[PDB]
RNA sequence: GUUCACCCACUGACAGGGAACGUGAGCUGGGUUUAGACCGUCGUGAGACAGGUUGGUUUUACCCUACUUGGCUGGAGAUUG
RNA sequence: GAACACAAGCGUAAAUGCUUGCUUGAUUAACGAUUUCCAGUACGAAUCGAGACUGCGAAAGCAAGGCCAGCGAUCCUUUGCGAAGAACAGGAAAUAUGAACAAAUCAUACCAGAGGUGUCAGAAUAAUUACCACAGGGAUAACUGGCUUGUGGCGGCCAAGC
RNA sequence: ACGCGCAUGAAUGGAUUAAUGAGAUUCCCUCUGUCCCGAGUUACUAUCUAGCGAAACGACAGUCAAGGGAACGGACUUGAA
RNA sequence: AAAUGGAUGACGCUUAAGCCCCAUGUGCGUGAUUGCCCAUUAUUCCUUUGGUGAGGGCGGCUAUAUGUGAGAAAGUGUAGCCCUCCCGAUGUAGACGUGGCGUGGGGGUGAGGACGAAGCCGAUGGCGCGAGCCUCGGAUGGACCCGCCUCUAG
RNA sequence: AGUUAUAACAAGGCUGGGUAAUUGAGGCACCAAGUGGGCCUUCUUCGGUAAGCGGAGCAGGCGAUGC
RNA sequence: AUCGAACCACCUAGUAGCUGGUUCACGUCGAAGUUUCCCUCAGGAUAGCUGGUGCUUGUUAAGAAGUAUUGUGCGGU
RNA sequence: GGGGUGCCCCCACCCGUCUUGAAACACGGACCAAGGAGUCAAACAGACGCGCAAGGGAGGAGUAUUGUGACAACUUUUCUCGUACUGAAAGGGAGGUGUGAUACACCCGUGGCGUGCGCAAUUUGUGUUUUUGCCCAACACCG
C-alpha cells in the first residue's frame, strides 16, 4: 500500500515554538585554529610578553600600597 | 479569550520549601526567612535562598581554597581594618596539601573533624549560622563563597562521545571492549 | 514499596502510559544488543564509538599480582606522618622516616609543593620526586 | 530527489550578464582585506577556483582569517530551530567590501563634528499653512476617456 | 447454461428500462469455482493453463416489524377538572 | 555563431581554444581548518593553507591531475616504512612483545595503501501447492452501493450539400 | 463427409472391434398431470384439549418518505401516520 | 427526459412573506449621531481554584466575675494563621503534583463492645467539587472491632 | 622571531580624555514520555477527459472541542 | 467418531514487529503523523514537538522580537 | 431545607474500541455474586533524602550473651571503590614566582586576560578594589 512521500507542513510552526535562537555573540568562540600559521605563531610571542608584564605590574602596585601602609 | 502566545514559556520553576528532613535545617530556614523579609539586606535574602537548595547544588569547599581567597583580599586592607568572615552554605573539608594557614573565622553548615582541628590549632574559630546572625546581622564584613561543581564525574559524561569535538567520557561497562585504535577516532576539534 | 509506584496512579487509565496507537508489545526492536550494526547503528556510533573492532596485543595468564604498584604524590606525604611530626622537623634537624611499603605504596611521584622534609623508603621513584625531595632537605632510600 | 549535486539550481544564478563578460579587473585585485571587516559574498563565475556554494551568494558576513589568496568569512545560517555560524574559505575575487555600516559611521563623524563646532533646522510639511491657488481646475470624468479605452 | 443473437409461426403489437446488475431461511443447480479422472500445449520435475471434457451434501423462523385474515375491550382535559 | 574525451548547464579571444618546446605538482605533505549530504555522523567529491623536494618561465607567477558525475565499513588476507653506524646507558636522538633466562627461525602488534560488498551505511541462497495451514488486514483486489463520464446511449445549434 | 491439423499420430502405443456397462450423448415407438390448467378423495400431522415439556438466539429496541451522514437509518433534521 | 410518494425545512406567500437597492424610539423634508431578538463572546458583580504572584498584622498592660463574644500558628501542602489586591482556568496520546480517598497485615498510641462487635438492609439525613466519611432506624445479627502516626502488599 | 629598502603598516596590550519605531524578563543544562498511517480549506500549482482521484509550496484548521 | 504424518505425558507459561484486554478522585501543563539510517515500507534507532528537575541572573534591558523605519547587498517568477 | 412519585414547557443519537473519519448497514456487548492483568532479582545511569569525607564501605568469619534472642552489641582491614593519568607495548608520570640558557635561589599560596553574586572603600547617583561559582580565548606541565 502506498503512503505519503514528503511534506513540510507544520514544520515552521514547530521551529518557532521555542523560537529560532539567535546566533552566538562574536566574542564567545573566537579561536583561529586553522588560520595563517606565520601570524598565529607571532601573536603567541607577544602574548607571552604581555603576561609577564601583567605579573610585574601587580608586584609594583602591591609594594607601593604596602609602603604607604 | 486572550492570545497567550508565549505566556506559558516564560514561567520559571521556583521552590519555596526544603525537601530536607533535618529539623535543625528548618530552624535556620525559619530564622533567615524572618531576617530576609525585615532587613532589606541582599546578603540575608541570598542566604535564605541557598538554604533551600538540594544537596547536589550545595557543593563542598576546601580549606585551601578558603585560605587562598582570604589572602588575595586581605593583602589590600588598610592600616586599621579587620579581616572579614568567610561564609559558606555547605560543608568545609580539610586539605592535606596546604598544612599552614593563618587564623581564619569561618561559618558553615558542617565541618569535618580534621578540618575543625586544623582551623582551631592555627588560632581561628568555627562558627554556626545562628552565631553569625547574632554578631553580624545584615552581613557586614563577610565574604561569601560557594565551592566547585565542574570537576564532578557526572559532568564528565554529559554529551556524546562520538561526535566531533566532544571530549565526553562514555558510559563503559567492559573497559577492555571499548578501546579503539589510535586512528579511526573522531575529530578532536570543531569550530 | 508498592504504594509509591506509578501502577497505583494508573488504576483506571486503561493504558498505563503506553498509548492507544503504538501499544505495549513484547520486543518491538529485538532482544538485548541486537541489530547494533543495522537498525541501532546511530545509537552505537554516537555513544559507544569504540565498541566494534579490535586493538592491541594479547596477554595469556595475566596474573595481576605481578603488576601491583600503587603511587602517592609528594603533596600527600603529610597524611602518612603524625600530626606533631609535620612541624617538628626542618632542614638540618632529625627528620621522620616514612616507609611506603607498610602503608601500601610502591612508587613515589613528585607533584605539588613539598611541606616538610623527611626520609622516604620506596621501591620506585620519579625524576622530579628525587630532585624535589633532595632540595627540601630529605632523601630517598630504595626498598625491595 | 534525483541529481542534487554541488551546483543544481545555478543556470541563471552563476550566469554573468549582458555585455559584461570578462575577468576581474585591476581594481578588484588591489582591494585590501583585514580581520574584522564586513564583506559580501558574490560569485564571479569566470573564476572557477574558490567559488562558494550557491547558498552563500548574496550573503554578508565578517572576516576571521586572511590568507595569501583567500579570505575566511563567518556567515549565519538557520538550521531547524537555531542559526549556525558557518565558516567558508573563498578566493579574493568572490568577495566585495560591504557598505552596510557607512551610514552608522557617518552618523558618528557628524556627532563629533557637531560637538567640535559647539566647543569652538528642518521644515515640517506636516504642520499646516496658508495656500493661495490663483487657479482651480475640475475633474469630471468626461465621456471621451470612456470611449478611449477601446483597442 | 446462457444474457445476447438467429430462424419457424400467430398477432392490433409482439417497445425499452429500474427496483442491492428486484427476488436462493421462495425454488432449481445447467454455468462458474475444491478434493477423483482423461486430452492438447507448456515445464527436467513437483506441477500450470480466463483451453476442452466427465462426476461432484443447497442448513435454521416458535422472536420484532411488514402483510393477510380472526377476535376481546377502553376512550372528548383522547383515561384526570 | 567553433573547440574544450563523454550528458547538459555555466565559462573563456594577444584565451580556459589550436600548434610547438621542455617536463612529471597525477610525489611527499608533521592527524591544520572548512563546504556540500547532514543527525550538523560517516563515505564520495571539493575549497583555503603550513613544511620538503621540484617543473616551466627573464620575471611577477602558475602547478600538489584532467572543475563541478565516474564509487565502498567491522573481521580477515596481503604489501610498504622502523637502512648501516654513533651513545658506559634508554636520554632531543636505538620500533615493541611472545611473561624463569639465553642463540637463531617463526608468529603477533602499532602507522600508511590494496583484494568488496551495484539490495551501493555493506545476510552466504532455487521451485511448487487445487491436499494445504496459522496470525492478521477493508492500510489491499474479485460481487452491491458512492464520485466521474473517456467509452457506450440519447438529443440541440449553424447550414455545404442530397 | 472434407482437412496447410493454434497444438492428431504409432507399447509417452496408432487404427479397428463382437460381447459386456447403476459410464457420456442423439433420435424413434409406446406411455403418461412434465405441461396447456388445474380439480376431487384418503392416512399421519399442523389446528383444540389432558399430561409432560426443551433449544437456538437475546447491547437497548422495533411505523414511514426525503435529507445530510463512514457515500443504502429503528434512533438524527423537516414532514406524514 | 427516469425509475417507492415528497420537499426554498413545512405551511404558505403575489398592494409578497419574491428580486435589486434605501431607512429607523416617542413625531421619517421641525428632536443630527442605539427600531428590536438570540451566545460557554465582551463589560460588570459574587464565589472557587492555581500562581514567575503583590502588599499588610503577629514584643498581645484599656477596662471589664457569674446568675458586646470568639479567635490570632513567623506559616509549601490541612477544617488552609488572618485580612486586602492583581492575573490565568476547556483538552486526546502523554508527563507531574496532592497534611488526596479507599482495602488486608506489622510496630506505636488512644478508645469501643452482651445496656449488643463485624456483616447485611434503607423515600435516614448531614458533610465534601470528588474519590468518600459520619449520624439515624432495623419489628436484622449474636462476638469481636476501630480513630491517629508510621511500616508493608497477592 | 609578521610585512615593507627603513618612516610606515599588521597583531596583542597598557595609561588619560569624550560618546532605528514600540513591545518586553536574557542565557545555560540534565533526565524522560507519546508520536513517526493523517485529513480538510484559501491562494500557487504538476499528472489525468474527469473524480468525494493521485502528488507538491505558503498559511489556517479538524484530529484533541465543545458553544 | 483423531491422518498431505495417530494417540498419551513431558521440554512448554515454546516465540509472536500481529489481534483482544488492562480496576480510585481532583489539580498544573500538554503534542505528533515530519528529518537521516536500517532485508527498511503494519517495526525500530536518530533529531524535532512535550513534561519534570533545575542552574545563573535582572528589575529599566544581558546574547530579546514569526513586526516596522533608514542605509546597503542578492534574485530572473 | 432535604428525600419519593406524577405532570407540564424546553434540551437530549448507544456504550467500549481500531481509525483521517462511528449513531452507524464496522467488531465485543441477556442479568447477578465472587475472582481477574507493570510483579520479584540482578548490572548501570539521572533527580531527591541521610551519614562520613581524601577518604567511604564492607563481606565471609569470630568474641560476648529463653532472654522483644534467625534480633541487637562488639572486631592503621584482610577486600573493594576513590585520591593520577597516559601508550599497542617495553615504559614513563603532572605547583608558583624570580634568575640564567634532575640548571640555580625562595615558598602566607589564585599562571595571565575578559564577563562575573555579595562584601569593602569613595562621590552624591557615579566611578573603584577583591572577586566566589560558571563560561570564553592564550600559556605552561605529564604521557
Ligand atoms: K608547497
Ligand atoms: K546478521
Ligand atoms: K457402470
Ligand atoms: K514511543
Ligand atoms: Mg508515512
Ligand atoms: Mg488522559
Ligand atoms: Mg509512558
Ligand atoms: Mg512503540
Ligand atoms: Mg431473500
Ligand atoms: Mg514433456
Ligand atoms: Mg572528478
Ligand atoms: Mg479502503
Ligand atoms: Mg516408436
Ligand atoms: Mg500423445
Ligand atoms: Mg461391473
Ligand atoms: Mg426511511
Ligand atoms: Mg485542565
Ligand atoms: Mg493479603
Ligand atoms: Mg488518532
Ligand atoms: Mg486495544
Ligand atoms: Mg492549556
Ligand atoms: Mg478505514
Ligand atoms: Mg462509538
Ligand atoms: Mg451506514
Ligand atoms: Na542572475
Ligand atoms: Na541494503
Ligand atoms: Na458521456
Ligand atoms: Na459520447
Ligand atoms: Na428556511
Ligand atoms: Na504505526
Ligand atoms: Na511464556
Ligand atoms: Na543490510
Ligand atoms: Na492495526
Ligand atoms: Na477485528
mmCIF file with all atom_site columns, C-alpha atoms (C1' of nucleotides) in Angstrom, chain K residues 37-138:
data_model
loop_
_atom_site.group_PDB
_atom_site.id
_atom_site.type_symbol
_atom_site.label_atom_id
_atom_site.label_alt_id
_atom_site.label_comp_id
_atom_site.label_asym_id
_atom_site.label_entity_id
_atom_site.label_seq_id
_atom_site.pdbx_PDB_ins_code
_atom_site.Cartn_x
_atom_site.Cartn_y
_atom_site.Cartn_z
_atom_site.occupancy
_atom_site.B_iso_or_equiv
_atom_site.pdbx_formal_charge
_atom_site.auth_seq_id
_atom_site.auth_comp_id
_atom_site.auth_asym_id
_atom_site.auth_atom_id
_atom_site.pdbx_PDB_model_num
ATOM 1   C "C1'" . A K 1 37  ? -3.707 -8.164  34.454 1.00 0.00 ? 37  A K "C1'" 1
ATOM 2   C "C1'" . G K 1 38  ? 3.510  -3.476  35.188 1.00 0.00 ? 38  G K "C1'" 1
ATOM 3   C "C1'" . U K 1 39  ? 5.470  -8.090  39.884 1.00 0.00 ? 39  U K "C1'" 1
ATOM 4   C "C1'" . C K 1 40  ? 10.242 -10.101 42.123 1.00 0.00 ? 40  C K "C1'" 1
ATOM 5   C "C1'" . A K 1 41  ? 16.012 -10.307 41.265 1.00 0.00 ? 41  A K "C1'" 1
ATOM 6   C "C1'" . A K 1 42  ? 20.492 -8.672  39.209 1.00 0.00 ? 42  A K "C1'" 1
ATOM 7   C "C1'" . A K 1 43  ? 24.154 -4.541  36.334 1.00 0.00 ? 43  A K "C1'" 1
ATOM 8   C "C1'" . C K 1 44  ? 24.245 0.631   35.125 1.00 0.00 ? 44  C K "C1'" 1
ATOM 9   C "C1'" . A K 1 45  ? 22.582 5.982   34.827 1.00 0.00 ? 45  A K "C1'" 1
ATOM 10  C "C1'" . G K 1 46  ? 19.947 10.635  36.465 1.00 0.00 ? 46  G K "C1'" 1
ATOM 11  C "C1'" . A K 1 47  ? 16.828 13.520  40.243 1.00 0.00 ? 47  A K "C1'" 1
ATOM 12  C "C1'" . C K 1 48  ? 15.725 13.872  45.538 1.00 0.00 ? 48  C K "C1'" 1
ATOM 13  C "C1'" . G K 1 49  ? 16.637 12.374  51.373 1.00 0.00 ? 49  G K "C1'" 1
ATOM 14  C "C1'" . C K 1 50  ? 20.566 10.785  55.139 1.00 0.00 ? 50  C K "C1'" 1
ATOM 15  C "C1'" . G K 1 51  ? 25.939 9.656   57.284 1.00 0.00 ? 51  G K "C1'" 1
ATOM 16  C "C1'" . C K 1 52  ? 31.053 10.493  56.674 1.00 0.00 ? 52  C K "C1'" 1
ATOM 17  C "C1'" . A K 1 53  ? 34.730 12.952  53.576 1.00 0.00 ? 53  A K "C1'" 1
ATOM 18  C "C1'" . A K 1 54  ? 40.828 12.498  50.701 1.00 0.00 ? 54  A K "C1'" 1
ATOM 19  C "C1'" . G K 1 55  ? 38.738 9.023   52.204 1.00 0.00 ? 55  G K "C1'" 1
ATOM 20  C "C1'" . G K 1 56  ? 33.990 5.861   52.180 1.00 0.00 ? 56  G K "C1'" 1
ATOM 21  C "C1'" . G K 1 57  ? 32.068 0.949   52.940 1.00 0.00 ? 57  G K "C1'" 1
ATOM 22  C "C1'" . A K 1 58  ? 32.184 -3.922  53.709 1.00 0.00 ? 58  A K "C1'" 1
ATOM 23  C "C1'" . G K 1 59  ? 31.532 -9.402  53.105 1.00 0.00 ? 59  G K "C1'" 1
ATOM 24  C "C1'" . G K 1 60  ? 32.807 -14.008 54.973 1.00 0.00 ? 60  G K "C1'" 1
ATOM 25  C "C1'" . A K 1 61  ? 34.008 -15.298 59.742 1.00 0.00 ? 61  A K "C1'" 1
ATOM 26  C "C1'" . G K 1 62  ? 34.842 -14.685 65.052 1.00 0.00 ? 62  G K "C1'" 1
ATOM 27  C "C1'" . U K 1 63  ? 34.035 -12.558 70.517 1.00 0.00 ? 63  U K "C1'" 1
ATOM 28  C "C1'" . A K 1 64  ? 30.493 -11.998 74.362 1.00 0.00 ? 64  A K "C1'" 1
ATOM 29  C "C1'" . U K 1 65  ? 25.325 -13.021 75.537 1.00 0.00 ? 65  U K "C1'" 1
ATOM 30  C "C1'" . U K 1 66  ? 14.952 -18.368 76.863 1.00 0.00 ? 66  U K "C1'" 1
ATOM 31  C "C1'" . G K 1 67  ? 16.256 -13.723 77.406 1.00 0.00 ? 67  G K "C1'" 1
ATOM 32  C "C1'" . U K 1 68  ? 11.487 -8.386  72.461 1.00 0.00 ? 68  U K "C1'" 1
ATOM 33  C "C1'" . G K 1 69  ? 17.489 -13.686 71.009 1.00 0.00 ? 69  G K "C1'" 1
ATOM 34  C "C1'" . A K 1 70  ? 17.138 -16.060 62.996 1.00 0.00 ? 70  A K "C1'" 1
ATOM 35  C "C1'" . C K 1 71  ? 17.111 -9.597  66.776 1.00 0.00 ? 71  C K "C1'" 1
ATOM 36  C "C1'" . A K 1 72  ? 20.550 -6.320  68.933 1.00 0.00 ? 72  A K "C1'" 1
ATOM 37  C "C1'" . A K 1 73  ? 26.108 -5.211  70.644 1.00 0.00 ? 73  A K "C1'" 1
ATOM 38  C "C1'" . C K 1 74  ? 31.455 -5.756  69.587 1.00 0.00 ? 74  C K "C1'" 1
ATOM 39  C "C1'" . U K 1 75  ? 36.172 -6.972  65.997 1.00 0.00 ? 75  U K "C1'" 1
ATOM 40  C "C1'" . U K 1 76  ? 46.475 1.899   60.998 1.00 0.00 ? 76  U K "C1'" 1
ATOM 41  C "C1'" . U K 1 77  ? 41.273 -4.457  57.305 1.00 0.00 ? 77  U K "C1'" 1
ATOM 42  C "C1'" . U K 1 78  ? 42.174 -8.869  55.111 1.00 0.00 ? 78  U K "C1'" 1
ATOM 43  C "C1'" . C K 1 79  ? 38.867 -6.896  50.098 1.00 0.00 ? 79  C K "C1'" 1
ATOM 44  C "C1'" . U K 1 80  ? 36.725 -3.206  47.071 1.00 0.00 ? 80  U K "C1'" 1
ATOM 45  C "C1'" . C K 1 81  ? 35.610 1.792   45.012 1.00 0.00 ? 81  C K "C1'" 1
ATOM 46  C "C1'" . G K 1 82  ? 38.346 6.659   45.011 1.00 0.00 ? 82  G K "C1'" 1
ATOM 47  C "C1'" . U K 1 83  ? 42.534 10.333  45.858 1.00 0.00 ? 83  U K "C1'" 1
ATOM 48  C "C1'" . A K 1 84  ? 46.617 10.131  38.504 1.00 0.00 ? 84  A K "C1'" 1
ATOM 49  C "C1'" . C K 1 85  ? 46.872 9.699   34.034 1.00 0.00 ? 85  C K "C1'" 1
ATOM 50  C "C1'" . U K 1 86  ? 48.986 8.003   29.546 1.00 0.00 ? 86  U K "C1'" 1
ATOM 51  C "C1'" . G K 1 87  ? 50.905 4.341   25.495 1.00 0.00 ? 87  G K "C1'" 1
ATOM 52  C "C1'" . A K 1 88  ? 49.577 -1.387  21.091 1.00 0.00 ? 88  A K "C1'" 1
ATOM 53  C "C1'" . A K 1 89  ? 53.723 -2.339  24.177 1.00 0.00 ? 89  A K "C1'" 1
ATOM 54  C "C1'" . A K 1 90  ? 58.603 -2.139  26.632 1.00 0.00 ? 90  A K "C1'" 1
ATOM 55  C "C1'" . G K 1 91  ? 57.771 2.116   29.918 1.00 0.00 ? 91  G K "C1'" 1
ATOM 56  C "C1'" . G K 1 92  ? 57.076 6.882   31.970 1.00 0.00 ? 92  G K "C1'" 1
ATOM 57  C "C1'" . G K 1 93  ? 54.383 10.013  35.209 1.00 0.00 ? 93  G K "C1'" 1
ATOM 58  C "C1'" . A K 1 94  ? 51.813 16.462  36.206 1.00 0.00 ? 94  A K "C1'" 1
ATOM 59  C "C1'" . G K 1 95  ? 52.776 23.537  41.911 1.00 0.00 ? 95  G K "C1'" 1
ATOM 60  C "C1'" . G K 1 96  ? 54.120 29.132  41.669 1.00 0.00 ? 96  G K "C1'" 1
ATOM 61  C "C1'" . U K 1 97  ? 57.383 33.221  41.159 1.00 0.00 ? 97  U K "C1'" 1
ATOM 62  C "C1'" . G K 1 98  ? 62.240 35.089  40.141 1.00 0.00 ? 98  G K "C1'" 1
ATOM 63  C "C1'" . U K 1 99  ? 67.340 34.499  37.602 1.00 0.00 ? 99  U K "C1'" 1
ATOM 64  C "C1'" . G K 1 100 ? 70.045 32.187  33.900 1.00 0.00 ? 100 G K "C1'" 1
ATOM 65  C "C1'" . A K 1 101 ? 70.405 29.202  28.965 1.00 0.00 ? 101 A K "C1'" 1
ATOM 66  C "C1'" . U K 1 102 ? 67.472 16.001  37.835 1.00 0.00 ? 102 U K "C1'" 1
ATOM 67  C "C1'" . A K 1 103 ? 70.351 24.491  35.919 1.00 0.00 ? 103 A K "C1'" 1
ATOM 68  C "C1'" . C K 1 104 ? 70.098 27.824  40.433 1.00 0.00 ? 104 C K "C1'" 1
ATOM 69  C "C1'" . A K 1 105 ? 67.611 30.530  44.831 1.00 0.00 ? 105 A K "C1'" 1
ATOM 70  C "C1'" . C K 1 106 ? 62.895 31.294  47.757 1.00 0.00 ? 106 C K "C1'" 1
ATOM 71  C "C1'" . C K 1 107 ? 57.694 29.137  49.492 1.00 0.00 ? 107 C K "C1'" 1
ATOM 72  C "C1'" . C K 1 108 ? 51.097 33.140  53.644 1.00 0.00 ? 108 C K "C1'" 1
ATOM 73  C "C1'" . G K 1 109 ? 49.780 30.471  48.090 1.00 0.00 ? 109 G K "C1'" 1
ATOM 74  C "C1'" . U K 1 110 ? 44.630 32.352  42.923 1.00 0.00 ? 110 U K "C1'" 1
ATOM 75  C "C1'" . G K 1 111 ? 49.576 31.186  35.548 1.00 0.00 ? 111 G K "C1'" 1
ATOM 76  C "C1'" . G K 1 112 ? 47.637 35.662  32.803 1.00 0.00 ? 112 G K "C1'" 1
ATOM 77  C "C1'" . C K 1 113 ? 43.186 38.126  30.166 1.00 0.00 ? 113 C K "C1'" 1
ATOM 78  C "C1'" . G K 1 114 ? 37.521 39.104  29.626 1.00 0.00 ? 114 G K "C1'" 1
ATOM 79  C "C1'" . U K 1 115 ? 32.277 38.854  31.572 1.00 0.00 ? 115 U K "C1'" 1
ATOM 80  C "C1'" . G K 1 116 ? 31.157 37.987  36.539 1.00 0.00 ? 116 G K "C1'" 1
ATOM 81  C "C1'" . C K 1 117 ? 26.606 37.065  43.027 1.00 0.00 ? 117 C K "C1'" 1
ATOM 82  C "C1'" . G K 1 118 ? 27.985 39.562  47.536 1.00 0.00 ? 118 G K "C1'" 1
ATOM 83  C "C1'" . C K 1 119 ? 31.246 42.451  50.525 1.00 0.00 ? 119 C K "C1'" 1
ATOM 84  C "C1'" . A K 1 120 ? 34.724 46.828  51.179 1.00 0.00 ? 120 A K "C1'" 1
ATOM 85  C "C1'" . A K 1 121 ? 36.058 51.886  50.299 1.00 0.00 ? 121 A K "C1'" 1
ATOM 86  C "C1'" . U K 1 122 ? 34.705 56.924  47.696 1.00 0.00 ? 122 U K "C1'" 1
ATOM 87  C "C1'" . U K 1 123 ? 31.045 60.958  45.062 1.00 0.00 ? 123 U K "C1'" 1
ATOM 88  C "C1'" . U K 1 124 ? 26.006 62.274  45.886 1.00 0.00 ? 124 U K "C1'" 1
ATOM 89  C "C1'" . G K 1 125 ? 23.932 58.665  41.902 1.00 0.00 ? 125 G K "C1'" 1
ATOM 90  C "C1'" . U K 1 126 ? 28.517 57.614  39.719 1.00 0.00 ? 126 U K "C1'" 1
ATOM 91  C "C1'" . G K 1 127 ? 33.148 55.552  39.308 1.00 0.00 ? 127 G K "C1'" 1
ATOM 92  C "C1'" . U K 1 128 ? 36.854 51.763  42.006 1.00 0.00 ? 128 U K "C1'" 1
ATOM 93  C "C1'" . U K 1 129 ? 39.119 47.056  44.780 1.00 0.00 ? 129 U K "C1'" 1
ATOM 94  C "C1'" . U K 1 130 ? 38.805 41.791  45.925 1.00 0.00 ? 130 U K "C1'" 1
ATOM 95  C "C1'" . U K 1 131 ? 36.400 38.787  43.316 1.00 0.00 ? 131 U K "C1'" 1
ATOM 96  C "C1'" . U K 1 132 ? 33.215 33.112  44.904 1.00 0.00 ? 132 U K "C1'" 1
ATOM 97  C "C1'" . G K 1 133 ? 30.663 29.549  41.338 1.00 0.00 ? 133 G K "C1'" 1
ATOM 98  C "C1'" . C K 1 134 ? 30.325 29.304  35.846 1.00 0.00 ? 134 C K "C1'" 1
ATOM 99  C "C1'" . C K 1 135 ? 31.733 30.289  30.959 1.00 0.00 ? 135 C K "C1'" 1
ATOM 100 C "C1'" . C K 1 136 ? 35.314 32.147  26.676 1.00 0.00 ? 136 C K "C1'" 1
ATOM 101 C "C1'" . A K 1 137 ? 40.040 32.696  24.450 1.00 0.00 ? 137 A K "C1'" 1
ATOM 102 C "C1'" . A K 1 138 ? 46.222 32.348  25.299 1.00 0.00 ? 138 A K "C1'" 1
#
